[PDB]
């Protein structure tokens, strides 16, 4: 199995959202992941694993799971706190058979505290820590940024960081430990720059009125003649200048870039410029310069974009595209993911594991 | 220094956005991070660092930087590709002094390809891979989800994963390597769930008309009588039933939860219910339930929320609050971050590092 985590053994207790995503990325980087599900997937996310079946509520399944866990470097579970405990698969039980295990617990609210037994989803976790409130236009209610911020950015990615950091600690202690990755916590650290900025006057709690939330005319999308969009990210003065040039606007005729009192006027002039031609026209004008202007591609258009083609950011699968592994490693590169295959018998994995 | 990465040595070449975020989290987790800037910060992101200065364009500075790098496990750089090369700090030159070094390159477009030399920001990177198009209400142009998706979720967090993955690899190969972390790639893996779902009809390219983007009435925010908001994430039927129960809506008088043709009617009925009382009302109603109904807190209110208090998700620093380290480790816990301190002498760090 190619990639830097070749040799790592992972047991994933089947769930939804951040747990399978973390398992996926360990698999993409070369780990040997075995997912235990209840008694061929069409779900590209279940790439790079073996799937086995056991009833964990039964003496036989629990015993088979414990044998797998005994041989594993990492366990991923994403149930409510207390669930693995009552199944016989809690950290203290696993430590009995394997004190080198990294026991990685992926929740929204965390292992403890007043909400920790309450159901939730991404939207809920980013609602409680200020994030959701900060997303969207000022004249509308907050819009969810899909489940990119709680489940993945602040969820699976922090579980991964915790797993891989604990493996580093294990090299000198000779032991594992439990990683408590809560989406409410990871997402907060993900947005740490905004928490920094609020202490210095560089971020307000006022929605849709900041440098990076669409409040700034030079950091936003604009609708083009064809009803399609471009994105403008020209924060630096020189990038801003290149953008005005591409639009054919004379800077002398415009308000200063950071005259906030005249931002409505600047936005209006930029709106009128972009509206005067179709997205593809601006994509060509701005293809090479430092103007920080890009066409806003829909998913179905991405695979035709030159920078996307040349770097092989995606590969074909199941009639559609899936992203290749990231990040990229110069010496122990990952390969193209292996599709979800047929279930295997669990005793065969146990056999293979030495 | 407390946490799982105690003992790791990181050199960060001072930059903006994802590179310092990555260095911060390594420091948070106990790493010994030394940031080289140009010749006391009030930026909380520069927590858990020693800051030194060197002119990398001068013979003397190049030499001091190489001596630091010779003692390090990790180098983080976020310049345009080619920049460290021309300075004499490129991967090949570092390898001559330290072939164990994990050389972590944090860019938007990646090391190679047609855009690799072009300026950009977060909004640009997520515009070319389908992400930005997917964010926002269907009747408005796309809205940037701050810089959480490109810079951090699909940026620093992939850099971190690659650093820690390559450290794992080194434990068996004895050697380091280069990590090419491109925000355009990392963000695409971040959103894999959507790429998977597109192939099975579980996600469409139509904006604002899916399960997780505000298209679904049970997965969205709602404005309350006070003009503040709740978030509803009640996907599963039993959570949805609990949400109806709290509102006191009779399900027999409503459209079925997943009759999409009647989602306008469902939304309007939910809108009228949540608008009838203030946000804090709904916190009382839904207490201890699985309704997936939470208050949408502004940043300035977060520190008063009981679940946030009880778990010490934040700590007080400088102006306001800053997020504590995440994720959390049972045996080698991180401690409260060290503030930015005065610049120190680079020869002093070398003496420290030997």
Author numbering:
A (entry chain A), B (entry chain B): 1 to 39, 45 to 359
Copy out sentences from the published article reporting this entry, exactly as the authors wrote them.
α-Methylacyl-CoA racemase in M. tuberculosis (MCR) has an essential role in fatty acid metabolism and cholesterol utilization, contributing to the bacterium’s survival and persistence. It catalyses the racemization of α-methyl-branched fatty acyl-CoAs, converting the (2S)-epimer to a near racemic mixture of the (2R)- and (2S)-epimers. The enzyme enables the conversion of α-methyl-branched fatty acids derived from cholesterol metabolism into forms that can be utilized by M. tuberculosis for growth and persistence within the host, a key component of M. tuberculosis pathogenesis. Within each active site, the large domain contributes the catalytic residues H126 (part of α-helix 3) and D156 (part of α-helix 5), while the small domain contributes a third catalytic residue, E241 (part of α-helix 9).
Crystals of the three MCR mutants H126A, D156A and E241A were obtained using identical conditions to those used with the wild-type enzyme and diffracted to 2.45, 1.64 and 1.85 Å resolutions, respectively. The overall structures for these single mutants were very similar to those of the wild-type structure, with small root-mean-squared deviation (RMSD) differences of 0.38, 0.37 and 0.38 Å for 693 Cα atoms of the H126A, D156A and E241A mutant structures being observed, respectively. The three mutants collectively had fewer hydrogen bond interactions; within the H126A, D156A and E241A mutants, 3, 5 and 5 interactions were observed, respectively. The active site of the D156A mutant has the fewest structural changes, as the H126-and-D241 dyad is retained along with the associated hydrogen bonding interactions. Within the wild-type, the D156 side-chain is hydrogen-bonded to a PEG molecule and a water molecule (which form part of a network which terminates with Y130) and a peripheral N152 residue. Consequently, as this D156 side-chain is mutated to Ala, these interactions are lost. Interestingly, the orientation peripheral N152 residue is unaffected and can form a hydrogen bond with part of the PEG molecule compared to the wild-type and the two other mutants. The rate-against-amount of enzyme plots show the expected enzyme-dependent increase in rate, while the specific activities calculated for wild-type, H126A, D156A and E241A were 46.4, 3.2, 18.5 and 12.2 µmol.min−1.mg−1. No significant change outside the enzymatic active site was observed in the three mutants, establishing that the diminution of catalytic activity is mainly attributable to disruption of the catalytic apparatus involving key hydrogen bonding and water-mediated interactions.
